[PDB]
Amino acid sequence: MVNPTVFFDIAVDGEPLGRVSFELFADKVPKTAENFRALSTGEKGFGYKGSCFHRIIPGFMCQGGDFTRHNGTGGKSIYGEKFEDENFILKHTGPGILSMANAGPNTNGSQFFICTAKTEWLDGKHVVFGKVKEGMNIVEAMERFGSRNGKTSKKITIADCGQLE
Amino acid sequence: XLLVTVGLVLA
Numbered sequence: 001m002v003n004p005t006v007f008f009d010i011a012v013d014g015e016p017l018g019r020v021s022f023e024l025f026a027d028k029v030p031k032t033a034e035n036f037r038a039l040s041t042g043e044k045g046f047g048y049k050g051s052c053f054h055r056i057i058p059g060f061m062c063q064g065g066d067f068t069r070h071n072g073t074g075g076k077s078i079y080g081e082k083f084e085d086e087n088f089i090l091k092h093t094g095p096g097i098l099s100m101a102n103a104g105p106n107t108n109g110s111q112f113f114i115c116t117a118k119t120e121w122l123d124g125k126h127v128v129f130g131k132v133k134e135g136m137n138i139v140e141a142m143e144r145f146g147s148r149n150g151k152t153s154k155k156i157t158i159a160d161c162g163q164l165e
Numbered sequence: 166x167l168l169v170t171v172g173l174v175l176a
Contacts, residue, residue, distance in 0.1 A: 055174070060167050073172060103172040113169045126169060150174070 003027060004163055006040040008048070010138055011159040012145065020114075020135035021164060022098055025128075029086045031079075032100065032108065032129040038078045039065075039110055040161045046076075048110075053156040056146025060119065062139060063101055063150075064158070065111035075110030082107050090128035092119040096139070098130035114139055 007021040026033035039047040046067060053064040054072045068074035077083050084106040092099060092115055099122065101111040114132060116139060132139060145152045166176045 057167070061169060063169055066171075072174070075171070099169075101169040101171050103170050107171070109171060111171050119167065121167070122169070 001026075002165065004033065004037050005133060005165040006037055006163045007135075007161060008040070008158045009160040010142065011157050012142075012154045014155075014157075016159060017141055018135060018138040020138050021133045022130045023133045024098075024130040025090065028089050029127060029129045031083065032086050032127050035077050035079065035083070035108075035110070036098075036112065036129065037163060039067075041163050042161075044078050048158050048161050051158055053142065053152065053158075055150035056143060056152050056156065057148060057150050058143045058146050059117055061113040061115045061117075062142050062146070062156075063111065063113040065101070065109075067110065072111075077109050082109050084108070085127050088124045088127060091123045092126070092128060094118045096132035096136055097128055098132070099126045099128045102126060116140070116143055 024033035051067040
């Protein structure tokens with residue numbers, strides 16, 4: 001076995017920006033990695049394709065994954081609405097870490113964030129499950145559209161996504 | 166501040 005690689009094609013107000021691919025650490029957090037992988041292929045009949053990054057704060061992170069309400073309040077996992085914090089083995093060590101957003105202990109759904117800096121205050125509270133493999137320059141380009149309070153100036157969407165490996 | 170939540174986003 002090998003860790004799955006999934007990709008997102010990002011568009012800015014409908015114009016293609018580029019592809020970011022991610023390695024998911026299924027060897028360390030199998031349940032959390034599987035949730036993100038199945039939401040990226042859309043194989044359960046719902047997922048990330050066509051959803052947006054609703055909150056981007058330059059120097060911190062890009063947050064997305066609300067494919068139900070689309071405004072930052074929704075999303076659901078493939079296990080039902082929410083699931084537990086699988087473990088906190090991995091930390092938020094630098095740019096490119098993929099981690100889960102939540103509303104406290106054991107509330108993981110589908111929303112996630114890509115870190116653009118080390119965010120150690122989130123360690124032990126948000127489950128790290130992947131990292132950017134290629135396309136960190138597209139994540140950096142995305143940051144230019146965010147703001148200190150998180151609203152974006154352009155609509156940043158996942159135009160397409162799926163599994164490569 | 167700098168949190169990443171779903172529901173009540175804080176400062």
